Amino acid sequence: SMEQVAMELRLTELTRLLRSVLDQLQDKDPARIFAQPVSLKEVPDYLDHIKHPMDFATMRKRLEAQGYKNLHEFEEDFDLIIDNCMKYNARDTVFYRAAVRLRDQGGVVLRQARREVDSIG
Secondary structure (H helix, E strand, C coil): HHHHHHHHHHHHHHHHHHHHHHHHHHCCCCHHHHHHHHCCCCCCCHHHHHHCCCCCCHHHHHHHCCCCCCHHHHHHHHHHHHHHHHCCCCCCCCHHHHHHHHHHHHHHHHHHHHHHHHCCC
């Protein structure tokens, strides 16, 4: 149906905007601390600590399959990256501190992304 096509176009355009948001957030991680999944070979206990691991690569796989239906879903995965790190790592570590800085800088980006998603529809 044409109604289905139109919904699919809206999902495509959201995907485009979330791809630009993702790029901008990932630039706030110049150390690439969040770029890839935590390796279970290197951190064998990880899944005892963290129940829903997340990272930018995994988000980009979901995005390319158009698997984010709204901005809330995308934000949920970004918050997992930050919040996972802040639980597993202590305050005194480069990992924790990187997550704080990514959260703070990313908030700016997400505030305007929300206005764009609402504005464009």
